[PDB]
């Protein structure tokens, strides 16, 4: 990450260096077009973080969840899905805890 970009800022080469990531920018206008919500699973502590960059890069709102957090925010984020008026379509979910 440092040898590619030492500035580690929001860059266009975040989603153009990988193969899932270029196609993910192909669907993100279309996911915003289709209006159907998408649940995506990731590995812990690293793949979600760079996905937090990319969904913020195309400016699609998103939630998150993990294992070393507290349980207070767990049930509240369940309640935020049950409201249908969510402007966020995609969000981030875990396999081992979630």
């Amino acid at each position: 990450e440092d040898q590619i970009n030492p500035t580690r800022e929001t860059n266009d080469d975040i989603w153009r260096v990988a193969g899932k990531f270029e196609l993910l920018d192909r669907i993100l206008p279309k996911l915003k077009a289709t209006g159907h919500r998408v649940l995506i699973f990731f590995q812990m502590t690293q793949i979600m973080d760079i996905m937090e960059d990319f969904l913020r890069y195309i400016n699609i709102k998103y939630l998150r969840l993990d294992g070393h957090t507290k349980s207070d925010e767990r049930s509240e984020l369940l309640r935020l899905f049950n409201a249908p008026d969510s402007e966020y379509l995609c969000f981030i979910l875990s396999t081992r805890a979630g």
Binding site: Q3, I4, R16, G19, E22
Partner: peptide, 17 residues
């Protein structure tokens, strides 16, 4: 642009630990 060398040969050195 396109999908795509200096980052590879540096990775050829740096990841060789």
């Amino acid at each position: 642009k396109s999908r795509l060398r200096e980052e590879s040969e540096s990775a050829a050195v740096y990841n060789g630990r």
